[PDB]
Design an enzyme around this catalytic site. Structure first.
Site, short mmCIF file in Angstrom:
data_model
loop_
_atom_site.label_atom_id
_atom_site.label_comp_id
_atom_site.label_asym_id
_atom_site.label_seq_id
_atom_site.Cartn_x
_atom_site.Cartn_y
_atom_site.Cartn_z
N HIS B 30 -27.99 -6.91 -3.89
CA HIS B 30 -28.48 -7.41 -2.61
C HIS B 30 -30.00 -7.41 -2.53
O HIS B 30 -30.56 -8.07 -1.64
CB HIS B 30 -27.91 -6.56 -1.49
CG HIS B 30 -27.92 -7.24 -0.16
ND1 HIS B 30 -27.12 -8.32 0.12
CD2 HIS B 30 -28.65 -7.01 0.95
CE1 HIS B 30 -27.34 -8.72 1.36
NE2 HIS B 30 -28.27 -7.94 1.88
N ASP B 52 -22.08 -6.78 -4.37
CA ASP B 52 -23.39 -6.74 -5.00
C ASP B 52 -23.49 -5.56 -5.96
O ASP B 52 -23.54 -4.40 -5.54
CB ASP B 52 -24.49 -6.69 -3.94
CG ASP B 52 -24.34 -5.52 -2.99
OD1 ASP B 52 -23.26 -5.36 -2.39
OD2 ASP B 52 -25.32 -4.76 -2.86
N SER B 104 -31.67 1.55 0.40
CA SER B 104 -30.69 0.55 -0.01
C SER B 104 -30.11 0.82 -1.39
O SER B 104 -29.38 -0.02 -1.92
CB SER B 104 -31.34 -0.83 0.02
OG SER B 104 -31.80 -1.14 1.32
#
Lengths: 49, 152, 152
Positions: B30, B52, B104
């Site tokens: 991502h 992802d 993330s």
């Protein structure tokens, strides 16, 4: 010439779709930590284990 | 190092993280950009589309001091970079909004350090937020994103 | 402790280290020049190229000079001729970078007396080194290597 080009393209599309099906099949085994690569090794690129 | 982050930096600034587990440098697909480290760039990162992940095999002798993956999860309190996650009934939550919008690639591990999942982001729901995760477990990988939890 | 591990000599130099357990004399198949003990070397041994193992059949007069063993691999950390070994996640490491070429043949133990691994070669990485051993599983015996080795 038309039947030759359609034979060429039909073979190419079949091969392309077969190899992308194999590529989709092999993907969730290269991702995970911990290699198992079970008894279906006949179509496999994951060598070292 | 113990923080697996190995900051993924793009245009000089940063854009997220990636982890190194078992034998694999995994990047959440991502995120765009390359990582900060130099020699971890010449690898053939394979691309999974529907979830992802951008895994690639470690090279030879590449200081394989990675974390340990145990494909099981009792329920309770696990460790996280910003605090302590609560896992109950298959649902997977933390305090709301305390997590930044850009953590993330931050993994999760137990008290001992046995990593299991990886993260995708959160949303704003109440005091407890739903942690949308892709996760490696059950001898495969999968994605559990709830409704309404937009990606970080 | 000392459990009669047997060296291979030639021209004055000793690297090959055979071991013998139960009924079978298990020898790594490197560095020929078969062992000094001719009462134990006059035996026609069977060689296996896949597993790199030598499988001589012990003489009956050596009925007592062997060890016990096991066909299961419990979890934790163990000892060996040099130091400690850590076996977790289904793979071995060696204590911190001490091995040298020619050590192929020492056995690995448990905390109570049995014998599991026989080491052929290993892989240098840095802090915790890797090594390839042959080990038991309920009479179906295989080989396992790490990736990045030089044979010892």
């Amino acid at each position: 010439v038309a039947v030759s080009v359609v034979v060429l393209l039909s073979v190419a599309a079949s091969v392309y779709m077969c190899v992308v099906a194999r590529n989709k099949c092999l993907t969730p085994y290269a991702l995970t930590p911990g290699a198992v690569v079970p008894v279906t090794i006949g179509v496999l690129c994951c060598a070292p284990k | 190092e113990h923080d697996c982050i190995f900051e993924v930096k793009h245009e000089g600034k940063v854009t997220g993280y990636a982890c190194l587990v078992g034998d694999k440098v995994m990047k959440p697909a991502h995120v765009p950009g390359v990582i900060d480290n130099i020699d971890l760039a010449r690898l053939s990162y394979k691309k999974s589309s529907k979830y992802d992940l951008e895994c690639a095999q470690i090279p030879v002798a590449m200081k394989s001091d990675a974390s340990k993956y145990t494909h099981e999860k009792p329920e309770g309190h696990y460790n996280w970079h910003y605090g302590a996650v609560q896992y109950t009934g298959g649902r997977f939550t933390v305090p709301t909004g305390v997590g930044k919008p850009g953590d993330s690639g931050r993994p999760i591990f137990d008290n001992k350090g046995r990593v299991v999942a990886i993260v995708l982001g959160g949303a704003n729901e109440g005091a407890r937020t739903a942690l949308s995760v892709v996760t490696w477990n059950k001898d495969m990988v999968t994605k559990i994103t709830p409704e309404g939890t937009e990606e970080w």
